[PDB]
Design a protein around this ligand. Structure first.
Ligand SMILES: Nc1ncnc2c1ncn2[C@@H]1O[C@H](COP(=O)(O)OP(=O)(O)OP(=O)(O)O)[C@@H](O)[C@H]1O
Ligand SMILES: [Mg+2]
Length: 601
């Protein structure tokens, strides 16, 4: 059926469909156009996604997962992940291959399985609206996502039962959403995307010649670990330091408080985008060697600005680089476009506006443009959106490690994709049976300072003197921005097998297994839902039967009043537990003993 567009966000997720030529954002079951990217695993075997997960995070801190996009496709020993380990209320662990995973109720889980739960909610949302199955999606990622991050996101799509037709870069999608109606003016635009977790800047040319729109990304830069979460973190730190002075208490040793404080800090932050001052007012934050304590701290807009100004400044540097790479000056920009909730902060808008010397547009929805853009991208693939052309780029240099630990660039950053690069490799020694190619992403001159994609071993090479064999290695980057390395003996043309060691990501076996796990979860969810309906029916029966007992009054035999009241009580207890059969049972017993009472009612 339809190709849905899914903005899979660090904080919030959004799904859009292509309704002919006009894109629509869909409301979820709770009635909302966006869904918090939060996943909770309950004590009773249910998975909660979004607002329901959000509400119970305080009672279930270790099993409520959020900001998973900031772990996906990363290594456990990464500096960013290591910092998050001591901050998150859930447990971050090392997978067998060294990847950053999470542990939930004693089960090791890969970030793609967790993100798949969000993707599933979005899929179902679309299916609820369309009244038919959805099997295909366009999924978004930050422009500055690396190979492992992109492939791990694509794997999340697959685990969610989605065929991922395209992985689209977030600013590119926003550009598609903007270029849909609007100019149209052979324009050159800067897309500034600051979200809950990631920051992207893309310079994009949109020229329309003979009713054929061409969207070309000139340059892209960013930081995949800079976002609203970091803004929140600065305010949280300020609050604990203030509380440590005014009460003498370190409040961080309390996980219930932290979580309510995290929500408090984010709420204050958002409040300060329209107020000049607010209060972080949390009563009963925790009880000490006395009794229930309450934090009440005033925070001005200026205080907040002062706490996050350096984070805002860190987003200005990549603008300079991207302008350099695009070969443009600030005055070459026709339009500045802000995307992401974090751009609603007056200071962000102000700093961006004074950098470009130009006001950002006000007619772009910073929450929905990306989802809408994904949906448009899907439309281009089916054909339902004609005369649109997309030329995106890869954001990072791809190279190999050479003698001395030095980087040799094979494909430079900002190269248009899809792209191919071939190079012939050979042996360095007599009877060499294997040659290793160490592939990396990054701009640094030394291999150790860049992101390793893995050791690509061309094994099983026929005996020969030095430099005999001619193995042509081809490096492909597809439309998704993802690398594919293949090899071939130059001379004959017969392929050459490639083994990847020391790499990150899920293998085919893990993925197949995880697909089945997600199907099983979906089935358990059905069971949790059914038990909720049963509890609902049980409560209706309680009430109905009490009204009837009440109405009969004096006329009811004492024997029957005793028995019915006992069975009502028994049902009430079952209804408080989590066992569907026991509820059905006590309901059935209640109906039997109250059968003559109900009959005359
Ligand atoms: N009015 C506001 N003022 C300032 N910040 C806000 C406001 N509303 C939301 N935010 C922040 O913006 C972030 C959410 O933005 P958004 O939903 O665009 O991010 P995302 O797409 O989920 O994240 P990413 O794109 O980084 O993966 C959160 O940090 C949130 O607290
Ligand atoms: Mg986003």
């Amino acid at each position: 059926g339809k190709i849905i567009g899914i903005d899979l966000g660090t904080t919030n997720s959004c799904v859009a469909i292509m309704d002919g030529t006009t894109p629509r954002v869909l409301e979820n079951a709770e009635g909302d156009r966006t869904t918090p990217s939060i996943i909770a695993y309950t004590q009773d075997g249910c998975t909660l996604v979004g607002q329901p997960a959000k509400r119970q995070a305080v009672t279930n801190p270790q099993n409520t997962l959020f900001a998973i996009k900031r772990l996906i496709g990363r290594r456990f020993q990464d500096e960013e992940v290591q910092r998050d380990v001591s901050i998150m209320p859930f447990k971050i662990i090392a997978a067998d291959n060294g990847d950053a995973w999470v542990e939930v109720k004693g089960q090791k889980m890969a970030p793609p399985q967790i993100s798949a739960e969000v993707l599933k909610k979005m899929k179902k949302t679309a299916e609820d609206y369309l009244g038919e199955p959805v099997t295909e999606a366009v999924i978004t990622v930050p422009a500055y996502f690396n190979d492992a991050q992109r492939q791990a996101t694509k794997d999340a799509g697959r685990i969610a039962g989605l065929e991922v037709k395209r992985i689209i870069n977030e600013p590119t999608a926003a550009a598609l959403a903007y270029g849909l109606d609007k100019g149209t003016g052979n324009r050159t635009i800067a897309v500034y995307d600051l979200g809950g977790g990631a920051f992207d800047i893309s310079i994009i040319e949109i020229d329309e010649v003979d009713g054929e729109k061409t969207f070309e990304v000139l340059a892209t830069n960013g930081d995949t670990h800079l976002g609203g979460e970091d803004f929140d973190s600065r305010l949280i730190n300020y609050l604990v330091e203030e509380f440590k002075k005014d009460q003498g208490i370190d409040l961080r040793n309390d996980p219930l408080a932290m979580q309510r404080l995290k929500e408090a800090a984010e709420k204050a932050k958002i409040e300060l985008s329209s107020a000049q001052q607010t209060d972080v007012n949390l009563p009963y934050i925790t009880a000490d060697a006395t009794g229930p304590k309450h934090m009440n701290i005033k925070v001005t807009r200026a205080k907040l600005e002062s706490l996050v100004e350096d984070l805002v400044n860190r987003s200005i540097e990549p603008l300079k680089v991207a302008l350099q790479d695009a070969g443009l000056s600030v005055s070459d920009i026709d339009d500045v476009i802000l995307v992401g909730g974090q751009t609603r902060m007056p200071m962000v808008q102000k700093k961006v506006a004074e950098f470009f010397g130009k006001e950002p547009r006000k007619d772009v929805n910073p929450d929905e443009a990306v989802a809408i853009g994904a949906a448009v991208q899907g439309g281009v693939l089916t054909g339902d959106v004609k005369d649109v052309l997309l030329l995106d780029v890869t954001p990072l240099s791809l190279g190999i490690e050479t003698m001395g630990g030095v980087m040799t660039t094979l494909i430079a950053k900002n190269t248009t994709i899809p792209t191919k690069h071939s190079q012939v490799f050979s042996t360095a020694e007599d009877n060499q049976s294997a040659v290793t190619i160490h592939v990396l992403q990054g701009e640094r001159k030394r291999a150790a300072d860049n992101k390793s994609l893995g050791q690509f071993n061309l094994d099983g090479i026929n005996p020969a003197p030095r430099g005999m064999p001619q193995i042509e290695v081809t490096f492909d980057i597809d439309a998704d921005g993802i690398l594919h390395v293949s090899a071939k003996d130059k001379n004959s043309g017969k392929e050459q097998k490639i083994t990847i060691k020391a790499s990150s990501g899920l293998n085919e076996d893990e993925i197949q297994k995880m697909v089945r796990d997600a199907e099983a979860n979906a089935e358990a969810d059905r069971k949790c839902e059914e038990l909720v309906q049963t509890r609902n029916q049980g409560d209706h029966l309680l009430h109905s039967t009490r009204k009837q007992v009440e109405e009969a009054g004096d006329k009811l035999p004492a024997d029957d009043k005793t028995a019915i009241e006992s069975a009502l009580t028994a049902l009430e207890t079952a209804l408080k537990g989590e066992d569907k059969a026991a509820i059905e049972a006590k309901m059935q017993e209640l109906a039997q003993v109250s059968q003559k009472l109900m009959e005359i009612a």
